[PDB]
Design a protein around this nucleic acid. Sequence first.
RNA 1: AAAA
Lengths: 164, 164
Amino acid sequence: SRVLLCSAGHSSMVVPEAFHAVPEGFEEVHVFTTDSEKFNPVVLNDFFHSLPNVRFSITKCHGLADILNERDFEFYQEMLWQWYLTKMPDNELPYVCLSGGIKSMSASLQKAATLFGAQSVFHVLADNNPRNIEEMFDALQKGQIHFIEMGYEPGWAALRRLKK
Amino acid sequence: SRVLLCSAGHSSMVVPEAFHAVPEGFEEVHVFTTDSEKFNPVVLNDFFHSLPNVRFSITKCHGLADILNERDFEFYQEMLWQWYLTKMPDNELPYVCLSGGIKSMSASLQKAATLFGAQSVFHVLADNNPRNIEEMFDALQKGQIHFIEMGYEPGWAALRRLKK
RNA sequence: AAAA
């Protein structure tokens, strides 16, 4: 199974855009984000539940709305890394999109990909930042969505073993 | 010399906020950004023109307006790391603010700090994102500007010698 | 998705 791992922020369209980084799409899409109300899950649940062959989940860093100090970041990172281990497939490395969330959320996800492994680690950028699924598809058909591979990450099998 | 190194984006207020990460201020602030016309330095230059004793410079990634693909990122990263070596002080590590620019710009800056060294690597966060100098001074008074330390970076003395 |  191809599995996509993503952080999310306010812009609802980055995870859907990231879902199109690969022609086949993805079998599983998993999101990690804060408890902030600046993240609205409804658009994500609507779109991904309407796709037939896709397992979708949103995991919140429970009790944390914002990363405002060092303890917040540490708590977020601990929850993200355990989440990464839980959601990644058993016989393959996941795909990882970094574009969602705040910079430090994204950098923590990059570090996780480096330690545990990622088949692909990528940014998605949009010329005109589509606001909804219809504009996303319009942007895709016009070649206005760009995917930037930051690099394959082998990770350490000695760390992937720890998921048990 | 306390020196601040910063990526810059379209929110012109992150660098003047970062200037206040340390009570004694910075003797030098150096900014690196893209060559896109969507970069308006005016409010940035206003702030440091009212601190004429601070050494201040803006360096552009000549020819690169955006990071749209892997070659764009790689060219950005090579100039950024050259500039980091050029700007960092001779006998102590610089301070590094990560909050400006797009995520990939910021990740490349953090990698440079990891490699060449940084006394401090921090994000600057604002409760309500000032848009102008007066709003920022108000937010600083009221403690609405937050600073997150991501970590001291010793770097490698063997790489620092290469500024020769 | 250039302070989410």
